[PDB]
């Protein structure tokens, strides 16, 4: 029930702003000074202008390194987020990974849904559950996902903990 | 630190899936059965096909009523979310409001950033802090925002509680 630093980076629903205290709302108390994610009054910096930073709440990183929505942000020059132009990836784009766990479809584009996450999915939030570990040719997970004891790709205590063969294994 | 029903509908960062227990991760434990928001394996239904439902995590509602990202969802037919086509609103579009608290720019388009939220902003997450209440011609907040005792538009205990002149005042 806490957002931002005090909530493990959770994000408020419907673009609600996370105040500097970790609570969700709308208004200057939440959206003004110290806003953490959501519809903050001052846009967070992103991409090239902000060391390759990603925007929260799936916001588009505009060509000038500002987070937002609308033509100016998702339109021409958009450096990340749900950009108006197809985002390439996969063997098709030198092993690039989609930002924010988006699936690299079989064709080399970034999205979320059966078309990207299903059959052929290359990296990200694939729903294919392709096997890893000693159990699977000693193959590794993409996105540095933790290969669990049971030979599964995921993120979490179950995956990243006790039994993790490879991946971002807890240490 | 809880997501979904047990977290007041908080959402995980970077499209992490909220398992049926309110925890954030990646994998079948979180993304499979019972997934709540984030990159769920089965897409949540939206718009027309799902009683005007909005997609979480700012996802695009495709023409067939499915939540996602990429051409198929944000492209042609997109019924909500950060749609590839400008979303109209404001006096320009019969008082329509942007979905998910997006600002209705001075021109009648939906976004988030200074261009929409700043000067001229019509409804949503305006950063203009235009005054309400008895303190302001007895004007009301848009989006049924709570007009606080001090004459401010917001959402939260401070706004919606004790002193609320109009808006979605707590009852």
Strands A67-68 and A146-147: unpaired
Q: What is the DSSP letter of A124?
A: S
- Full set of structural domains in chain A with CATH: 2-42 (3.30.60.10), 43-85 (3.30.60.10), 86-128 (3.30.60.10), 129-171 (3.30.60.10)
Cα(A39)–Cα(A70) distance, integer angstroms: 13
Considering CB atoms only, which of A12, A113, A155 is closest to B66? Answer: A113
Report the C-alpha gap between A44 and B43 in whole angstroms. 29
| Interchain CB distance below 8 Å, A58 and B58 | yes
B95 is in an annotated binding site: no
Of the residues A3, A5, A11, the best mutation for testing chain B's interface (the one with the most B CB atoms within 10 Å of its CB) is A11
Q: Cα separation of A29 and B156, whole Å?
A: 9
Helix (H, G, I), strand (E, B) or coil at A53: strand
Query: Three-state DSSP class for A52?
Result: coil
What are the Cα distances from residue A127, in Å, to A104, A148, B82, B118? 12, 16, 23, 40
Among A13, A30, A155, select the one facing B56 at the smallest CB separation: A13
For the record, the structure tokens of A65 come out as 């390194």
- How many CB atoms sit inside 10 A of residue B91's CB? 10
Please give the method by which this entry was determined.
X-ray
Which tokens in the block code for residue B89? Answer: 């609103």
Q: How far is A150 from chain B (nearest CA, A)?
A: 12
- Token digits for A109? 């584009």
Best of B22, B27, B40, B133 to disrupt the A interface by mutation (most A CBs within 10 Å)?
Answer: B27
Smallest CA–CA separation between A127 and chain B, in Å?
6
- Whether residue B42 contacts residue A160, with contact meaning beta carbons closer than 8 Å, is answered with no
| List of residues 6+ apart from B136 with CB closer than 8 A | B130, B151
- What's the rounded Cα separation, in Å, for the pair B147 and B154? 7
DSSP one-letter code for A29: H
CA atoms within 13 A on the CB side of A163: 14
Contact A23, A56 (CB under 8 A): no
Task: Compute CA distances A89 → A78, A167, B61, whole Å.
Answer: 16, 20, 23
> What are the chain A neighbours of B148 within 8 Å (beta carbons)?
27
Q: How far apart are CA A34 and CA A28, in angstroms?
A: 10
Closest Cα to residue B104, out of B129, A29, B132, B118?
B118
Cβ of A111 and B39 within 8 Å? no
Q: What is the C-alpha R_g of chain B?
A: 18
Chain B neighbors of A39, CB-CB under 8 A? 101, 112, 117, 125
- The single residue listed with the structure tokens 């917001």 is B154
Q: How many helices (H) and strands (E) does chain A have?
A: 4, 8
**B149 to chain A, minimum CA–CA distance in Å?**
13
Spatial neighbors of A58 by CB under 8 A, at least 6 apart, are A81, A82, A100, B15, B57, B58, B59, B69, B82
DSSP output for A66-114: BEEBSHHHHSTT--BSS-SS--B-BGGGTTB--GGG-EE-TTSBEEBSH
3-state secondary structure chain B: CCCHHHHCCCECHHHCEECCCCCEEECHHHHCCCCCCCCCCCCCECEHHHCCECCCCCCEECCCCEEEECHHHHCCCCCECCCCCCCECEHHHCCECCHHHCEECCCCEEEECHHHHCCCCCCCCCCCCCCCECCCCCECCCCCCEECCCCCEEECHHHHCCCCCECCCCC
Calpha distance B64→B51 (Å, rounded):
13
Query: What is the rounded distance in angstroms from the CA atom of residue A151 to the CA atom of residue A171?
Result: 18
What would the two tokens of residue B36 be?
A: 């709540």
Can you read off the two tokens belonging to residue A39?
């519809």
Mutation to test the B interface, candidates A58, A81, A110, A116, most B Cβ within 10 Å: A58
Cα angle B131, A71, B84; round to 5: 115
> Under a CB-based contact definition with an 8 Å cutoff, are residues A85 and A77 in contact?
no
């Amino acid at each position: 029930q806490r957002c931002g630093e005090q909530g493990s980076n959770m994000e408020c629903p419907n673009n609600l702003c996370c105040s500097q205290y970790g609570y969700c709302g709308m208004g200057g108390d939440y959206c003004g000074k110290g806003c953490q994610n959501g519809a903050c009054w001052t846009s967070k910096r992103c991409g090239s202008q902000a060391g390759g930073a990603t925007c929260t709440n799936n916001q588009c990183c505009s060509q000038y390194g500002y987070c937002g929505f609308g033509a100016e942000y998702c339109g021409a020059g958009c450096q990340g987020g749900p950009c108006r132009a197809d985002i390439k990836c996969g063997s098709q784009a030198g092993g690039k990974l989609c930002p924010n766990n988006l699936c690299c479809s079989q064709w080399g584009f970034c999205g979320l849904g059966s078309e990207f996450c299903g059959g052929g999915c290359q990296s990200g939030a694939c729903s294919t559950d392709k096997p890893c570990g000693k159990d699977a040719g000693g193959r590794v997970c993409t996105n540095n996902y933790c290969c669990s004891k049971w030979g599964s790709c995921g993120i979490g205590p179950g995956y990243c903990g006790a039994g993790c063969q490879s991946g971002g294994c807890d240490g």
